[PDB]
Short mmCIF file of all heavy atoms in Angstrom, two decimals:
data_model
loop_
_atom_site.label_atom_id
_atom_site.label_comp_id
_atom_site.label_asym_id
_atom_site.label_seq_id
_atom_site.Cartn_x
_atom_site.Cartn_y
_atom_site.Cartn_z
N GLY A 1 1.35 9.12 -25.17
CA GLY A 1 0.83 9.59 -23.93
C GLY A 1 -0.53 9.84 -23.99
O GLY A 1 -1.11 10.54 -23.23
N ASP A 2 -1.24 9.06 -25.08
CA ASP A 2 -2.73 9.16 -25.09
C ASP A 2 -3.41 8.51 -24.05
O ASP A 2 -3.03 7.49 -23.44
CB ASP A 2 -3.07 8.52 -26.45
CG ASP A 2 -4.60 8.73 -26.80
OD1 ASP A 2 -5.12 9.79 -26.43
OD2 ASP A 2 -5.21 7.75 -27.37
N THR A 3 -4.53 9.12 -23.64
CA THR A 3 -5.32 8.65 -22.51
C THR A 3 -6.89 8.80 -22.71
O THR A 3 -7.40 9.63 -23.21
CB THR A 3 -5.02 9.43 -21.24
OG1 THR A 3 -5.42 10.83 -21.43
CG2 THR A 3 -3.47 9.34 -20.85
N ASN A 4 -7.54 7.76 -22.18
CA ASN A 4 -8.91 7.70 -22.12
C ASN A 4 -9.43 7.65 -20.70
O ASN A 4 -8.44 7.35 -19.82
CB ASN A 4 -9.42 6.47 -22.95
CG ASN A 4 -8.73 6.25 -24.20
OD1 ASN A 4 -8.46 7.27 -25.02
ND2 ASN A 4 -8.37 5.02 -24.47
N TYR A 5 -10.67 7.88 -20.38
CA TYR A 5 -11.25 7.75 -19.11
C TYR A 5 -12.65 7.44 -19.17
O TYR A 5 -13.36 7.57 -20.15
CB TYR A 5 -11.03 9.06 -18.29
CG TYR A 5 -9.49 9.51 -18.15
CD1 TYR A 5 -8.98 10.49 -18.83
CD2 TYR A 5 -8.81 9.06 -17.00
CE1 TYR A 5 -7.54 10.76 -18.62
CE2 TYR A 5 -7.61 9.47 -16.67
CZ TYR A 5 -6.97 10.36 -17.57
OH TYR A 5 -5.63 10.78 -17.31
N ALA A 6 -13.20 6.95 -17.95
CA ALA A 6 -14.57 6.61 -17.80
C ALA A 6 -15.13 7.95 -17.31
O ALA A 6 -14.55 8.61 -16.44
CB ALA A 6 -14.83 5.53 -16.96
N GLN A 7 -16.23 8.38 -17.82
CA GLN A 7 -16.78 9.78 -17.44
C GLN A 7 -16.64 9.94 -15.93
O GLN A 7 -16.43 11.18 -15.60
CB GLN A 7 -18.39 9.62 -17.76
CG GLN A 7 -18.63 9.67 -19.27
CD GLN A 7 -20.19 9.55 -19.64
OE1 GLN A 7 -21.00 10.33 -19.17
NE2 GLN A 7 -20.44 8.53 -20.49
N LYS A 8 -16.88 9.05 -15.06
CA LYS A 8 -16.71 9.13 -13.63
C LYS A 8 -15.40 9.74 -13.13
O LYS A 8 -15.34 10.65 -12.38
CB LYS A 8 -16.93 7.90 -12.87
CG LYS A 8 -18.32 7.44 -12.72
CD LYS A 8 -18.54 6.52 -11.61
CE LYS A 8 -18.15 7.13 -10.31
NZ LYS A 8 -18.42 6.27 -9.09
N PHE A 9 -14.23 9.27 -13.70
CA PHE A 9 -13.00 9.75 -13.25
C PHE A 9 -12.35 10.84 -14.16
O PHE A 9 -11.16 11.10 -13.98
CB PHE A 9 -11.98 8.62 -13.14
CG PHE A 9 -12.51 7.47 -12.22
CD1 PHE A 9 -13.27 6.51 -12.72
CD2 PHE A 9 -12.29 7.50 -10.82
CE1 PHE A 9 -13.82 5.45 -11.99
CE2 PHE A 9 -12.88 6.50 -10.05
CZ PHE A 9 -13.59 5.50 -10.62
N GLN A 10 -13.04 11.41 -15.01
CA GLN A 10 -12.55 12.53 -15.86
C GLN A 10 -12.35 13.66 -14.79
O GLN A 10 -13.30 14.15 -14.29
CB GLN A 10 -13.52 12.98 -17.02
CG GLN A 10 -13.61 11.94 -17.95
CD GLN A 10 -14.58 12.28 -19.14
OE1 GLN A 10 -15.77 12.32 -18.97
NE2 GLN A 10 -14.03 12.49 -20.39
N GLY A 11 -11.14 14.21 -14.85
CA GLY A 11 -10.75 15.40 -13.94
C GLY A 11 -10.51 15.07 -12.59
O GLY A 11 -10.15 15.86 -11.71
N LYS A 12 -10.66 13.78 -12.24
CA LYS A 12 -10.30 13.31 -10.86
C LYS A 12 -9.04 12.54 -10.88
O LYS A 12 -8.27 12.45 -9.84
CB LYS A 12 -11.47 12.53 -10.26
CG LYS A 12 -11.45 12.12 -8.80
CD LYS A 12 -12.46 11.20 -8.40
CE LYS A 12 -12.53 10.95 -6.83
NZ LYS A 12 -12.81 12.31 -6.11
N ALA A 13 -8.79 11.90 -12.07
CA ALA A 13 -7.56 10.95 -12.25
C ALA A 13 -6.65 11.28 -13.45
O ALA A 13 -7.18 11.55 -14.46
CB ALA A 13 -7.98 9.51 -12.23
N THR A 14 -5.45 11.63 -13.19
CA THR A 14 -4.55 11.95 -14.18
C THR A 14 -3.44 10.82 -14.51
O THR A 14 -2.65 10.49 -13.60
CB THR A 14 -3.73 13.22 -14.00
OG1 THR A 14 -4.48 13.94 -12.89
CG2 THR A 14 -3.82 14.12 -15.27
N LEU A 15 -3.48 10.14 -15.68
CA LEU A 15 -2.50 9.24 -15.99
C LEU A 15 -1.30 9.68 -16.72
O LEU A 15 -1.40 10.58 -17.69
CB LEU A 15 -3.17 8.06 -16.84
CG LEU A 15 -4.51 7.60 -16.23
CD1 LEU A 15 -5.04 6.43 -17.26
CD2 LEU A 15 -4.34 7.04 -14.85
N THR A 16 -0.09 9.33 -16.26
CA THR A 16 1.08 9.79 -16.80
C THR A 16 2.20 8.52 -16.90
O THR A 16 2.24 7.78 -15.98
CB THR A 16 1.81 10.92 -16.18
OG1 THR A 16 2.12 10.64 -14.77
CG2 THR A 16 0.76 12.04 -16.12
N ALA A 17 2.94 8.54 -17.99
CA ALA A 17 3.91 7.42 -18.18
C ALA A 17 5.38 7.97 -18.29
O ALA A 17 5.60 9.12 -18.72
CB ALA A 17 3.67 6.61 -19.33
N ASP A 18 6.31 7.34 -17.82
CA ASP A 18 7.74 7.75 -17.86
C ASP A 18 8.56 6.62 -18.45
O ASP A 18 9.18 5.86 -17.89
CB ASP A 18 8.22 8.03 -16.50
CG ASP A 18 9.79 8.44 -16.51
OD1 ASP A 18 10.35 8.42 -17.52
OD2 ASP A 18 10.37 8.58 -15.51
N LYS A 19 8.42 6.53 -19.80
CA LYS A 19 9.00 5.47 -20.66
C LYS A 19 10.49 5.27 -20.30
O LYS A 19 11.11 4.16 -20.53
CB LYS A 19 8.86 5.74 -22.17
CG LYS A 19 7.54 6.35 -22.50
CD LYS A 19 7.36 6.15 -24.00
CE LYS A 19 8.28 7.01 -24.77
NZ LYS A 19 8.10 7.02 -26.28
N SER A 20 11.14 6.34 -19.76
CA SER A 20 12.55 6.20 -19.32
C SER A 20 12.73 4.99 -18.31
O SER A 20 13.90 4.67 -18.25
CB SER A 20 13.07 7.51 -18.84
OG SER A 20 12.74 7.81 -17.40
N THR A 21 11.81 4.83 -17.54
CA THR A 21 11.88 3.67 -16.63
C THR A 21 10.72 2.77 -16.56
O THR A 21 10.62 1.92 -15.76
CB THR A 21 11.85 4.46 -15.10
OG1 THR A 21 10.61 5.19 -15.00
CG2 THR A 21 12.99 5.32 -14.93
N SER A 22 9.83 2.86 -17.71
CA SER A 22 8.73 2.02 -17.80
C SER A 22 7.85 2.04 -16.61
O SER A 22 7.66 1.03 -15.94
CB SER A 22 9.15 0.60 -18.15
OG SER A 22 9.68 0.45 -19.34
N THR A 23 7.47 3.20 -16.19
CA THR A 23 6.81 3.30 -14.95
C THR A 23 5.50 4.24 -15.17
O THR A 23 5.42 5.56 -15.09
CB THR A 23 7.50 3.98 -13.83
OG1 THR A 23 8.65 3.11 -13.58
CG2 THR A 23 6.73 3.91 -12.40
N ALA A 24 4.27 3.65 -15.42
CA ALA A 24 3.02 4.41 -15.65
C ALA A 24 2.68 4.95 -14.27
O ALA A 24 2.71 4.17 -13.15
CB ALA A 24 1.94 3.54 -16.21
N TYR A 25 2.07 6.16 -14.22
CA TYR A 25 1.55 6.63 -13.02
C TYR A 25 0.13 6.98 -12.92
O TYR A 25 -0.56 6.96 -13.96
CB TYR A 25 2.46 7.87 -12.53
CG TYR A 25 3.79 7.74 -12.17
CD1 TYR A 25 4.89 7.49 -13.19
CD2 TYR A 25 4.27 7.80 -10.91
CE1 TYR A 25 6.15 7.45 -12.90
CE2 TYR A 25 5.59 7.80 -10.56
CZ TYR A 25 6.68 7.48 -11.65
OH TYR A 25 7.90 7.53 -11.30
N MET A 26 -0.34 7.45 -11.76
CA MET A 26 -1.75 7.75 -11.59
C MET A 26 -1.80 8.75 -10.41
O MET A 26 -1.30 8.45 -9.17
CB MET A 26 -2.65 6.65 -11.29
CG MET A 26 -4.07 7.09 -10.84
SD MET A 26 -5.16 5.74 -10.41
CE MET A 26 -6.06 5.47 -11.97
N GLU A 27 -2.49 9.91 -10.64
CA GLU A 27 -2.64 10.87 -9.49
C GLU A 27 -4.14 11.04 -9.35
O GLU A 27 -4.90 11.13 -10.25
CB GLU A 27 -1.96 12.16 -9.89
CG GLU A 27 -1.84 13.14 -8.79
CD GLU A 27 -1.29 14.54 -9.22
OE1 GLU A 27 -1.33 14.75 -10.30
OE2 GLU A 27 -0.73 15.33 -8.31
N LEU A 28 -4.62 11.16 -8.04
CA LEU A 28 -6.08 11.35 -7.84
C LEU A 28 -6.17 12.50 -6.95
O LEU A 28 -5.46 12.78 -5.96
CB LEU A 28 -6.53 10.20 -6.97
CG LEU A 28 -6.45 8.74 -7.63
CD1 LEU A 28 -6.74 7.59 -6.75
CD2 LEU A 28 -7.26 8.69 -8.87
N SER A 29 -6.97 13.53 -7.62
CA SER A 29 -7.29 14.80 -6.96
C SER A 29 -8.53 14.89 -6.06
O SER A 29 -9.41 14.04 -6.16
CB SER A 29 -7.28 15.89 -8.01
OG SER A 29 -6.12 15.87 -8.70
#
C-alpha cells in the first residue's frame, strides 16, 4: 500500500487499493 505523489496533489488525492478485487481507488478532496 505504499504511495507517492507530486507535490501538487499531496493532501488533495488519496490512493487506496483493494487487492481482494484488484481495484485501485482514488479520492479527491
Side-chain angles (χ1 to χ4, degrees):
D2 183 35
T3 63
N4 315 317
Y5 295 99
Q7 295 175 53
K8 283 202 61 177
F9 307 88
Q10 285 179 296
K12 189 183 186 67
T14 346
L15 311 180
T16 61
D18 176 4
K19 319 195 302 182
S20 76
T21 58
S22 290
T23 306
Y25 293 75
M26 170 183 267
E27 199 187 13
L28 300 173
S29 303

